[PDB]
């Protein structure tokens, strides 16, 4: 009844396959050095975000649903959804007790403090710090730590309609997958928790609207805080520094 069928189990396996690489170790370099640095600057935070952003691009290209889109459609989705996806990764990797984010391949010793916010754009940093903690707090402990749930939330975020997308076929594909991954997440949660999953399903829209709010208010967070020669270019396409 609530147990997953073969088609649902297959959909989940495909998702897990696409995300292979997300939790891999970092090669020696600028980004890894920034993550291991005890005293991190805003540029170091940008260097760290670069790793996750690149990995999101790689994941998306491994998903058959994504490759049904035109190249412009793909671009529009990644551009529109990246900050929300990063925020969801943030929820997966955050610890309220230590007040910090960690990465799966490295001990909990290496981390990024929630207080990194305090070095960013003074006009908006305190509000963004509050928004992230507020968003984190809505999640049940065992839901935020579930890689499949997090992966599905990321995919629902990615496959969200954008007014930037005009192509009729792309728009159809995006809407279809938004509903597909939403339905799959609900079925997955029902398979684990039965009727208790109904309450979690009802919270999905709350999560999505809060994510959108975070994305819509984060764009100037790094303004005036970074020397471009010290920060990876990819995150600077999403967060204006000058």
């Amino acid at each position: 009844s609530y147990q997953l069928n073969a088609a649902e189990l297959q959909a989940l396996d495909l998702i897990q396959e696409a995300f292979k690489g997300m939790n891999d170790p970092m090669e020696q370099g600028r980004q890894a050095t920034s993550f291991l640095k005890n005293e991190k600057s805003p540029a170091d935070i940008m260097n760290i975000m670069d790793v996750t952003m690149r990995r999101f691009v790689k994941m998306a290209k491994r998903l058959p649903a994504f490759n049904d889109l035109s190249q412009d459609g793909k671009f529009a989705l990644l551009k529109g959804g990246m900050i929300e996806m990063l925020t969801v990764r943030g929820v997966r990797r955050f610890d309220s007790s230590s007040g910090s984010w960690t990465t799966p391949t490295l001990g909990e010793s290496s981390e990024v403090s929630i207080n990194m916010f305090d070095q960013l754009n003074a006009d908006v940093r305190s509000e963004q710090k509050m928004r992230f903690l507020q968003f984190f707090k809505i999640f049940h402990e065992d839901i935020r730590s579930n890689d499949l749930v997090i992966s599905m939330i990321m995919l629902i975020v990615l496959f969200s309609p954008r007014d930037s997308i005009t192509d009729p076929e792309d728009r159809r594909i995006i809407a279809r997958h938004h509903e597909q991954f939403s339905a799959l997440l609900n079925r997955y949660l029902e398979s684990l928790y039965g009727d208790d999953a109904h309450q979690l399903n009802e919270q999905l829209p709350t999560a999505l609207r809060m994510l959108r709010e975070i994305s819509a208010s984060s764009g100037m967070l790094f303004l005036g805080t970074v020397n471009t020669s010290e920060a990876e270019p990819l995150p600077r396409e999403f967060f204006k520094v000058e």
């Binding site: 690149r54 691009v57 790689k58 998306a60 290209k61 190249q71 793909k74 671009f75 990644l78 551009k79 990246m82 270019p233 990819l234 396409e237």
Partner: peptide
């Protein structure tokens, strides 16, 4: 114009 994002999206990984 998000040139690097586009480049990464369109490359052969």
């Amino acid at each position: 114009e998000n040139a690097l994002l586009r480049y990464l999206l369109d490359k052969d990984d």
